[PDB]
Write a protein that binds this ligand. Structure first.
Ligand code: NAD
Ligand code: NAD
Ligand code: 9TY
Ligand code: 9TY
Ligand code: MG
Ligand code: MG
Ligand code: MG
Ligand code: MG
Lengths: 343, 340
């Protein structure tokens, strides 16, 4: 039933002689810009006057204001925060978007809210990666890719689909798989992962730490076991490949497997499933959308306070103590986004 | 304060002219054996007559029964399942362990239950890695390592500490850090991660999947979001480096950060931390030890049924469908454990 594109279902032919304007040079923008350039696609970056403008210049990109980038582009990727879409679309994009040009968003939220809208004579699409920037870039350089969902919202040209999938191939998403999914469903899925799953996973790791520390366990050891060692991370990432219960079957001692299966499906009270439903209601009904616009109206002042408050929590105090005392294995990220060969 | 050993705090000098018997060639045994050999340490494998014996032979090791390996070793690493420690210790190890030899376990359970005990004239220690085999081997080959906890239980020789830490350096654990921790605390801590945290994390991922599917979301998309994409896994592994809240701050869109910080610290009712306490009580009070021994009866037949049942849960049915339709980034594992 599902429509999933891999390398055999896309080509770079539709990008021959075309310029892509990458609007934004943040988590997504930098990854798209780097992968597109290395794939032999003509890229220019449109960015406001901030640290990202200078980074784009530092990493060898042709950088201008947003309006000028859009004016000289056949394809425009709008890779800036979703609350900024409305103003940038109205002022910078819509007036400068050429006849037959394609506009892409990496998240359906601005489409659901009507902040980005179809324009006569132009194509509108969602190409939404299921991964953040650093892994999109590392996977690409390894001849691999992150998954993505796509939706052709408007297709005046009749060539929107092949151009979207050509971008997807150039950035490496088709090496994993690019699946058709409506922008509205993508929005709700995406916000659910960020508002229920991620907070609940960290809350669970934190609960583990807090209980162990209170029961007289060495705080450094407690932190390492609940995530600091990387073991829980490796389980979840290896789990993505072969399956979560399968990782336990293959890599777990009999003691570990017996323990795991004793409590598997018995740890959570019904209230967690009930909360998941409540979070979806806030996301679908407009409650979250209103909450977000209030938080954005102050240049995310509340968010800055929350971020600084989070670093004071015992879990993050213990993290700093563990990281100073134990060396964690990491790859050098220095030249990660500088020019490379097509893999 | 905490006693943490790195490469500057250990050497391979104590292993000069010493033979290490790796007892078992499973998840830990294979990684210990491979890393010790590549570090220029003399290694022997002691194993019962099963697939692991043939694998050890296939990967170029000297392989014998457990009794023979122990008899020809200055250091013995007991890397077999914990319920098998008692019988192997009494029949195969204790009668054959040389004067001034060192016995190491990688988990304190058999020490707590008194299935492995101090022997006159001999050293007994725990060196417990905080990671499973494949990552320990990949890390080692990249000039890296995983953390470990160690405990010198009996030191007749007076040289147990430097011999245990020499093993830790040879296998690569000192590249991360090797911290002193009591075998009793290690036991309870290790079982807590396996019995509360790991089940609770998968239970939560499964709850996310089952709610999305129930609400009419694309099952493949639902599965990908809750872990299948690798995004949740990458967050947790990157989080080990820089902190979980910090990953969100660095890698999250403003929309993501606002959503995250709305429910952060508010998702779990008090009942979750209460169940965590109950799991620890079972681990500390002997309830789990009794359960494990019952489960070990008839070569873990109950566990075999649980493993087969797990593969048929909606989550794992959806995983197989996703993994068939979406290619995941993997690294070649062929000859990962062959000589470097
Ligand atoms: N974070 C991710 O990994 C990720 C994943 C998939 C989808 N997305 C989507 O990609 C888009 C970009 O998100 P991101 O995480 O890269 O964001 P980010 O916070 O990294 O964005 C920074 C970029 O946005 C620009 N910017 C910020 N405020 C602006 C404004 N008012 N006007 C113009 N430009 C402004 C900055 O100059 C910079 O180039 C969003 O639609 C988001 O939902 C992000
Ligand atoms: N699994 C891990 O990654 C991990 C991590 C840290 C600590 N440990 C500890 O390492 C030890 C070994 O665990 P593992 O995960 O490698 O186990 P495993 O399931 O991989 O063990 C298989 C090995 O044990 C041998 N074996 C099995 N039953 C035996 C028996 N009755 N008598 C003799 N040999 C027998 C097999 O021949 C084989 O060599 C345990 O004490 C465990 O707690 C394991
Ligand atoms: O680290 C441990 O203890 C594991 C085990 O199987 O015992 C790998 C999980
Ligand atoms: O910040 C975002 O929006 C993420 C996404 O995948 O949508 C990275 C989490
Ligand atoms: Mg997402
Ligand atoms: Mg998002
Ligand atoms: Mg264990
Ligand atoms: Mg462990």
């Amino acid at each position: 039933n599902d429509l999933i594109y891999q390398d055999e279902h896309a080509s770079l032919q539709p990008l021959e002689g075309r310029t892509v304007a990458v609007i934004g040079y943040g988590i997504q923008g930098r990854a798209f810009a780097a992968n597109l350039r290395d794939s032999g696609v003509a890229v220019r970056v449109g960015n406001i006057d901030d640290r990202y403008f200078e980074l784009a210049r530092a990493e060898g990109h042709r950088v201008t204001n947003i309006a000028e980038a859009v004016a000289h582009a056949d394809i425009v990727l709008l890779l800036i925060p979703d609350e900024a879409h409305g103003a940038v679309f109205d002022v910078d994009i819509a007036p400068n978007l050429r006849d037959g040009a394609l506009l892409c968003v990496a998240h359906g939220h601005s489409l659901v809210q009507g902040d980005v809208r179809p324009l006569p004579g132009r194509d509108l699409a969602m190409l939404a990666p299921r991964m953040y920037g650093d892994p999109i870039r590392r996977y690409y350089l390894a001849g691999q890719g992150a998954p993505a969902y796509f939706d052709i919202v408007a297709d005046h040209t009749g060539r929107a689909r092949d151009r979207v999938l050509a971008i997807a191939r150039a950035v490496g998403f088709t090496r994993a798989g690019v699946m058709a999914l409506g922008y509205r469903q993508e929005t709700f899925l995406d916000l659910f992962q960020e508002q229920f799953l991620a907070p609940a996973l960290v809350d669970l790791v934190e609960t583990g730490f807090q209980v162990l520390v209170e029961r007289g366990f060495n705080p450094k050891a407690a932190l390492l076991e609940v995530y600091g060692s990387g073991e829980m991370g490796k389980m979840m990432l290896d789990g993505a490949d072969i399956g979560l219960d399968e990782v336990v079957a293959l890599q777990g001692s009999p003691t570990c497997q017996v323990g795991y299966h004793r409590w598997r499906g018995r740890t959570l009270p019904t209230a967690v499933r009930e909360l998941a439903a409540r979070v979806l209601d806030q996301i679908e009904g407009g409650d979250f959308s209103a909450y977000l616009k209030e938080q954005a109206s102050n240049d995310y002042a509340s968010l800055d306070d929350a971020r600084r408050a989070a670093l004071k929590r015992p879990l993050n105090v213990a993290h700093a103590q563990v990281r100073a005392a134990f060396r964690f294995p990491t790859e050098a990220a220095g030249g990660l986004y500088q020019a490379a060969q097509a893999p």
